[PDB]
């Protein structure tokens, strides 16, 4: 890395975002994410509306890797995409960008019908590190999906702070099952 961006290469891939082939558009989004240059942001925001879900997924991933805050509002809209894997990608991307504007929408995604979206929402909330997400993550310790539970537990640990500690104490006192184990372990290992 630490590459100086080759303008001809970026221009080439940006143009390929308009190719007739979904594969070429997908590959261009992927390439642009790896290059990491902000010239790609507005073109990728458009690709985030591509007719092909595979292209939309790749565009969200690339926007996350570039990390430009102009992507936040469009990715927030992508959290409502009809395609579950696009929502998952948008959640992951928003986590990577780290912008607090994504917190409320991600909390909503914690209730998504798809388990893989919920995992990504939990993870992203952990990465952003905003205490706002404590109660929603606490509730996710009761999720039907065991991986979602685990991701929420990890996210609480990433956020840390007094509010998490206070919530863990309540669970330590009166919680049961997985949530209790999470809380007791947390308190034993923290401060």
Domain ranges, residue 83: 1-191
**Separation CA 28–CA 158 (nearest Å):** 33
* Final resolution, Å: 1.8
Report how far apart, in Å, the C-alpha atoms of 150 and of each of 94, 138, 164 are. 20, 11, 16
User: HEC string of the chain?
Assistant: CCCCCCHHHHHHHHHHCCCCCHHHHHHHHHHHHHHCCHHHHHHHHHHCCCCCHHHHHHHHHHHHHHCCHHHHHHHHHHCCCCCHHHHHHHHHHHHHHCCHHHHHHHHHHCCCCCHHHHHHHHHHHHHHCCHHHHHHHHHHCCCCCHHHHHHHHHHHHHHCCHHHHHHHHHHHHHCCHHHHHHHHHHHHHCC
Total of domains in the chain:
1
The answer to whether 76 and 43 have CB atoms below 8 angstroms apart is no
The answer to whether 25 and 52 have CB atoms below 8 angstroms apart is yes
Q: How far is CA 47 from the centre of its chain?
A: 18
The answer to whether 55 and 22 have CB atoms below 8 angstroms apart is yes
Structural biology method used: X-ray
Which CATH number do you get for residue 139?
Answer: 1.25.10.10
The answer to whether 12 and 32 have CB atoms below 8 angstroms apart is no
- Hey, what are 54's tokens? 């595979």
The answer to whether 178 and 186 have CB atoms below 8 angstroms apart is no
How far does the chain reach from its first CA to its final CA, in angstroms? Answer: 38
């Amino acid at each position: 890395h630490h590459h100086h961006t080759d303008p001809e290469k970026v221009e080439m891939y940006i143009k390929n975002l308009q190719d007739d082939s979904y594969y070429v558009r997908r590959a261009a989004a992927y390439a642009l994410g790896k290059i990491g240059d902000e010239r790609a942001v507005e073109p990728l925001i458009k690709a985030l509306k591509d007719e092909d879900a595979w292209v939309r997924r790749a565009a969200a991933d690339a926007l996350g890797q570039i990390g430009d805050e102009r992507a936040v509002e469009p990715l927030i809209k992508a959290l409502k995409d009809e395609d579950g894997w696009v929502r998952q990608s948008a959640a992951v991307a928003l986590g990577q960008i780290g912008d607090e504007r994504a917190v409320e929408p991600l909390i909503k995604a914690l209730k998504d019908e798809d388990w893989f979206v919920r995992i990504a929402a939990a993870f992203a909330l952990g990465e952003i590190g905003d205490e706002r997400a404590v109660e929603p993550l606490i509730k996710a310790l009761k999720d039907e999906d065991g991986w979602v539970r685990q991701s929420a537990a990890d996210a609480l640990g990433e956020i840390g702070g007094e509010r998490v500690r206070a919530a863990m104490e309540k669970l330590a006192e009166t919680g049961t099952g997985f949530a209790r184990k999470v809380a007791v372990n947390y308190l034993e290992t923290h401060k």
